Amino acid sequence: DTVTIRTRKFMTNRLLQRKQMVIDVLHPGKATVPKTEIQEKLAKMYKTTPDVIFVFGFRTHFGGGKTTGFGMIYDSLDYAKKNEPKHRLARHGLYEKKKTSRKQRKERKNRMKKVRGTAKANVGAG
């Protein structure tokens, strides 16, 4: 058999420039569907493209089949690069959280507190 999608409580949002709805996946079949496939079907359903369509939170019911999540369709890629929590952009390459570790940031800041003026030993020399 094959996957189906249907949509619930659809709403167009002109204040964040998007469309948001609840997504139900029907799949009498063999696993909860990958996100990358669901955004294809949403693209061919709402006729835009599979790069402004962000979907999240899918969970599948006891006894399989019906599975439910939330979806967003942004009217452009700049607005989609705008609001979009940065962890969700990083789900498909559009952002990259570059840092190391919270304890390093912490212990560094506390060494920079003990020098005055140009802090060369820690703005450069770690």
Binding site: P28, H61, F62, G63, G64, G65, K66
Partner: protein, 188 residues
């Protein structure tokens, strides 16, 4: 100390005061055997729910009729008791609530209704059917032998749409004893 948690919970049963009472013992064992229950905690549970229903009914019954609170809560308790079918629609008044019995609630279980409706060969077969994911209530597969079946839901119990007993691929035993013809006597 502050946390976003909830601590609300309760017990659902009460032990008997007299621990070793031959009559109570054999009456509760009769009841365990004829409904195919696992424990006596599963009898004390139903006893507790029946006792609480009785307490609420007797509490409403001491108010004077035409009292709005009695009217509201009585018409609600009666409707909620008929919704599961442990009360006749032709009685529907707080006087008949004090005439129920423990085996009106044990009747309405799912294990009982799966055997009694004819999907199983005994109650001890019905429990292992339900607990092995063979049974479906509408579209839901229900794993729980204590699922109290509402009235309108009585028509809809049948087998799961992916299970050997009806429109399902055969289990792992019918597929190695069949592989016995290929990998047990044809390949080894």
């Amino acid at each position: 100390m502050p946390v976003a948690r909830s601590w609300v919970c309760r017990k659902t049963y009460v032990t008997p005061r007299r621990p070793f009472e031959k009559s109570r013992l054999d009456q509760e064992l009769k009841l365990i055997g004829e409904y195919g229950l696992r424990n006596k905690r599963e009898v004390w549970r139903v006893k507790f729910t029946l006792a609480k229903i009785r307490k609420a009914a007797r509490e409403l019954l001491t108010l004077d009729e035409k009292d709005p609170r009695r009217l509201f809560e009585g018409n609600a308790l009666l409707r909620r008791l008929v919704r599961i079918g442990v009360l006749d629609e032709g009685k529907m008044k707080l006087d008949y609530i004090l005439g129920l019995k423990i085996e009106d609630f044990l009747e309405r279980r799912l294990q009982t209704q799966v055997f009694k409706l004819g999907l199983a060969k005994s109650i001890h077969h019905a429990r292992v059917l339900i607990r092995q994911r063979h049974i479906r209530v509408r579209k839901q597969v229900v794993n729980i032998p204590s699922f109290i079946v509402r009235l309108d839901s009585q028509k809809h119990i049948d087998f799961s749409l992916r299970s050997p007993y009806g429109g399902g691929r055969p289990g792992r035993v019918k597929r190695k004893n069949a592989k016995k013809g290929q990998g047990g006597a044809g390949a080894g």
